Symmetry: C2
Subunit: 249 residues, 2 copies
């Protein structure tokens, strides 16, 4: 539940970070297998008692020390060579998130956060924007990798309401973890999405909160990992305003 | 005309890239300052070195309506593309300098400020990025298509419901993905590099697509009008794919303002 395993996450984040980096050079998904295997394998060895949740009834979090990982977030980008793919390694214990280590492979940024001990990216300490005016917010969001008839109106409509509140703008970059990190750094003021598995927000959650940001459920309430839905923002006013326009549908 | 001018294009994209990159370290106060500095820094030097050249920029168009490309040597400029990103320190802003002659796009030069990516294109001389020669993906199935689009700066049921409908139409086809990064120039350089397959937008100033057009073309891709016909700088709209099929498949999806 601390340091010894946190430094384990950083290097592993780095090793995998190095593995897909020179590999990013339609199923190169073997890279997914090489980086996960390599990470879950070295962590299972060094910490046998620990549990593991990751893109293997899914995000059932116990109270025992567990690891939530995403071998390579931004796989659709990776395919097309579109520079935005990360590695997420989140760590829980007592059924709460302890720390997070996201890694931007291309641009080489090591976003990391730890419960109580602040958030950081390659040295510089992170701190969210603090925006509260929806009309000044840069909102990031993703689209379910799953494409079926009506799971659409939740994208086009959500985007619709949010878009009229006078959002200064809207992004979609093909990577929830990285989008979440833009939130922690301050480059964005909010994020929302339906359909992101927990291994995408476990790491990013400790990071954002350790930078002053908040992470709740799409419905104004608290974050629920088993939900596959989240709404994080710079401030509470912002966050609530987001869950507002947001349609639980 | 072409050598002295192109190298001038580079020097300035760069210098400006430089003065902007530093700036990314308050309100929308400073962006406007930088936009004016960069703009005045770029324009005043070219007008001095080439006192006969014409300009298609944001700060000329004061003439009401604009983007009228004559036959004389003209510079299409965008001192800062991605100013909203600039405001929020979202790492995606560019400087763009296009050059036309005989009413044709001669060379493009777009600089990715933060990522230090310097894109250039020259009629018949190939497209590049930091030395690396560029080439489009050549993907042809809208189902494996990574598509890019941007929403204009304006917000009104008009230009809004349109964006959504087009988005809907594009998602209606099995488009493998959609990206919106807050930069049409950079969105376009990705199409030219192979990192994306298509792009489309209604309401984009012509200075945001002059340089970018030479580049996508010189890389192997095609840039056409939203209706599927020939590109029209006066239309403020576009479709750009890696293949003519991809291109028509996009225009096929969307239609126009009404």
């Amino acid at each position: 539940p601390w340091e010894e395993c946190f430094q384990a996450a950083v290097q592993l984040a780095l090793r995998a970070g190095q593995i897909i980096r020179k590999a990013l050079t339609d199923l190169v998904t073997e890279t997914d297998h090489l980086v996960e295997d390599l990470i879950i394998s070295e962590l299972r060895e060094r910490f046998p008692s620990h549990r593991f949740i990751a893109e293997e009834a899914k995000c059932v979090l116990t109270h025992s020390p567990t690891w939530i990982i995403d071998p390579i977030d931004g796989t659709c980008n990776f395919v097309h060579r579109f520079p935005t793919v990360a590695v997420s390694i989140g760590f829980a214990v007592r059924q709460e998130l302890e720390f997070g280590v996201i890694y931007h492979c291309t641009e080489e940024r090591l976003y990391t956060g730890r419960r109580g001990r602040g958030a950081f990216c390659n040295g510089q300490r992170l701190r969210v924007s603090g925006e509260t005016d929806l009309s000044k917010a840069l909102v990031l969001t993703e689209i379910g990798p799953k494409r079926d008839p009506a799971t659409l109106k939740l994208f086009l409509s959500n985007m619709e309401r949010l878009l009229h509140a006078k959002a200064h703008g809207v992004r979609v970059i093909g990577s929830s973890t990285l989008a979440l990190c833009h939130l922690a750094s301050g480059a964005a003021d909010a994020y929302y999405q339906f359909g992101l598995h927990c291994w995408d927000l476990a790491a990013a959650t400790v990071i954002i909160r350790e930078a002053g940001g908040i992470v709740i459920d799409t419905s104004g309430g608290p974050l629920d990992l088993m939900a596959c839905r989240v709404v994080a923002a710079s401030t509470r006013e912002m966050a609530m305003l987001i869950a507002q326009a947001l349609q639980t549908i």
